[PDB]
Design a protein around this ligand. Structure first.
Ligand SMILES: [Cl-]
Length: 279
């Protein structure tokens, strides 16, 4: 063991660096596309002349962008009062995008009050937070990182572009490595889980029956190492945890964790290329 724990920890550290680079790339892709949507001719045309015809052109464009990019669960334009005016929804499982006529007043949401505080054409983002409809949680639960940009015409604010980056999709895309056979969990700065192969530990800050699933409660002596935002590992005698930190469209850290119990560690002793084949 001792050496096998260590060798596994070294592999997991490589995996954490790999996956951190993938999130950094996703962030660059989101920054670029948010800037293009906020400066787009189709949106400009609609805001100048919000005819049904121009709304259709905008909706078709956003639906195309959602199908092409996959990581936006919604793309919306809210007016200055916080009422949704344009709302494209995308479902990654089916690949269907299209507009909804279910348009709500979002003015009570904190992410909206934050967007109002931004300058014209300034792109910023809200912390990861579950989606809601009329204040009720959307189920299945939907953690979103909302990109926010007030949009102006001749210096007069028209509303806000809002893009909901779908953390469940990104987790599904990024957080399992078939070659190294590792699952990466995402743990927020507050200690609660927003992605895991174990669904039952998610969102303990929101779901009462899960409030025990905080990394700081689970691994009190390992938590400080994670909070340091350095990459490293710790082994408690029962779990090997390898950890790293990134900043993903946020000034707060997001911690990426590979947590393997003794039982799981024993088995990768067996690992052979023939195991990878071909699944
Ligand atoms: Cl709401």
């Amino acid at each position: 063991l001792a050496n096998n724990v260590e060798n596994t920890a070294k592999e997991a550290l490589h995996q954490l660096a790999y996956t951190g680079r993938e999130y950094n790339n996703i962030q660059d892709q989101i920054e670029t596309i948010s800037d293009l949507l906020g400066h787009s001719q189709s949106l400009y045309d609609y805001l100048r002349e919000p005819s049904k015809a121009n709304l259709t052109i905008l909706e078709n464009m956003w639906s195309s962008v959602a199908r092409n990019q996959k990581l936006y669960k919604q793309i919306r334009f809210l007016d200055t009062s916080g009422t949704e005016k344009v709302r494209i929804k995308y479902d990654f499982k089916t690949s269907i995008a299209g507009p909804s006529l279910i348009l709500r007043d979002k003015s009570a949401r904190e992410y909206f009050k934050y967007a109002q505080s931004l300058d014209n054409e300034q792109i910023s983002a809200w912390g990861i937070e579950l989606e809601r409809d009329k204040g009720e949680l959307v189920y299945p639960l939907s953690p979103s990182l909302r990109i926010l940009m007030p949009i102006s015409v001749n210096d007069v604010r028209q509303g806000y572009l809002v893009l909901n980056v779908d953390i469940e999709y990104l987790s599904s895309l990024l957080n399992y490595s078939p070659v190294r056979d590792f699952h990466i969990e995402l743990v927020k700065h507050k200690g609660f889980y927003i992605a895991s192969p174990d669904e039952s530990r998610l969102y303990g800050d929101i779901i009462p029956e899960r409030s025990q699933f905080n990394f700081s409660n689970m691994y009190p002596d390992i938590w400080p190492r994670v909070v340091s935002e350095q990459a490293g590992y710790s082994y408690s005698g029962e779990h090997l945890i390898a950890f790293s930190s990134i900043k993903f469209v946020s000034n707060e850290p997001l911690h990426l964790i590979i947590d393997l119990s003794n039982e799981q560690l024993s088995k990768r002793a067996t690992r052979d290329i023939n195991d990878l084949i071909q699944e």
